Amino acid sequence: SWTDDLPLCHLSGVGSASNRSYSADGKGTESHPPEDSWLKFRSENNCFLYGVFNGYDGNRVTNFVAQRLSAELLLGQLNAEHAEADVRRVLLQAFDVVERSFLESIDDALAEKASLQSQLPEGVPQHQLPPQYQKILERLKTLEREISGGAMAVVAVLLNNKLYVANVGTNRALLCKSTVDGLQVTQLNVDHTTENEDELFRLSQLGLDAGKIKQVGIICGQESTRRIGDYKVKYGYTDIDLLSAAKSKPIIAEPEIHGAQPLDGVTGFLVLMSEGLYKALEAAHGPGQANQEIAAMIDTEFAKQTSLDAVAQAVVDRVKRIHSDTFASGGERARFCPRHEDMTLLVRNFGYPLG
Ligand SMILES: [Mn+2]
């Protein structure tokens, strides 16, 4: 938590809300601990770092990634006078170090887990286990919490008024430019899913059947084809149907880095958002319009709110209302909105007027 001493960026805002499942009858929701996270830091120079992270299976990986990525980038590694090629290399190394050091951090616990499993009669219902093996089982559950979890991440670095985006997974970055002819919205990164052809290709080159992968859509509760952490899929993919044939890790942690974006004389804002936010909007309004809608909602709030945090939080709140109303209306799409995931929205302003 040395990051709590880091200068926060005054040109950005974050809005968020936790996952929720609606109760069948009546009003009342249930939530599991939130697993999203973010960061908005300004370094020495006119150097800025922003990120939105989406975890699953706990939030230990989400926090490990946020903390370590900060350590690998805001402690000197990023320099104003660096060439684009340098910045690409620095981001690439930061993610590689974050992934390798995370896996090294759980190694011992993985070994202890294996040893405890060897002492435990396999396949026996918890209640039928005598007291002796009960204690071991509990220790196994404690180790499981300590080593499990995964995370997707989209990061954006603003260096000498040039913008870079590093992305692993399905979070999104949008650059919204106010042109003479409306608000121009462009998604800077690309979603790493079984619908991303280049990823179906990468998975094809490893020996997996792209057709079956594409059909199924999800690889272990997650549709993201790139993730950080997640030992289940990084080590035991050999034993996972769709992945069985893989010659090397199907799910990787390498980021896709997107070309420098000049921002000189650009007026608008940058949006980083988690999968939970846009997926919820699409569950309620239908396939493919989340980007335009979210950017339009943010546009509207820019004129009414008095801080970027309020701008971001208002949009997150509107999406939550749209979503619960749809489920409550019992209407046509109610079947798609019984619950929603964590939502995070970060907005970094580039001269757009507020209030
Ligand atoms: Mn999540």
In the chain, which ranges are E strands?
Answer: 12-17, 20-22, 29-30, 36-42, 47-56, 150-159, 162-168, 172-179, 182-187, 228-229, 256-262, 268-273, 339-340, 343-350
The dihedral formed by the CA atoms of 232, 234, 240 and 242, expressed in degrees to the nearest 10: 140
Instruction: Give strand pairing partners of 225.
Output: none
Which sign does the torsion angle of CA 284, 285, 287, 290 carry?
A: negative
Distance 30 CA to ligand 1 centre (A): 15
Q: Do 308 and 13 form a contact (C-beta atoms < 8 A)? A: yes
Distance 272 CA to ligand 1 centre (A): 15
Which amino acid appears at position 63 of this protein? N
Q: What is the resolution of this structure in A?
A: 2.3
Distance 218 CA to ligand 1 centre (A): 14
Distance 326 CA to ligand 1 centre (A): 22
Alpha-carbon 227 to chain mean position = 9
Which amino acid appears at position 191 of this protein? D
Distance 270 CA to ligand 1 centre (A): 22
Q: Do 260 and 286 form a contact (C-beta atoms < 8 A)? A: no
Distance 34 CA to ligand 1 centre (A): 8
Distance 230 CA to ligand 1 centre (A): 13
Distance 149 CA to ligand 1 centre (A): 10
Distance 95 CA to ligand 1 centre (A): 19
Of 186, 180, 187, 184, residue with least CA distance to 299: 184
Instruction: Count Cβ atoms below 10 Å from residue 127 Cβ, excluding itself.
Output: 6
Angle made by CA atoms 30, 33, 39, in degrees to the nearest 5:
130
* Fold of the domain spanning 1-355: Phosphatase 2c; domain 1 (3.60.40)
Q: Give the method used.
A: X-ray
How far is residue 161's CA from residue 217's CA, in Å, rounded to a whole number? Answer: 38
Distance 168 CA to ligand 1 centre (A): 14
Residues within 5 A (CB) of ion ligand 1: 35, 54, 56
Q: Do 255 and 167 form a contact (C-beta atoms < 8 A)? A: yes
Alpha-carbon 76 to chain mean position = 25
Alpha-carbon 346 to chain mean position = 12
Of 148, 152, 147, 143, residue with least CA distance to 55: 152
User: Which is it for strands 228-229 and 150-159: parallel, antiparallel or unpaired?
Assistant: antiparallel
Instruction: Count Cβ atoms below 10 Å from residue 214 Cβ, excluding itself.
Output: 16
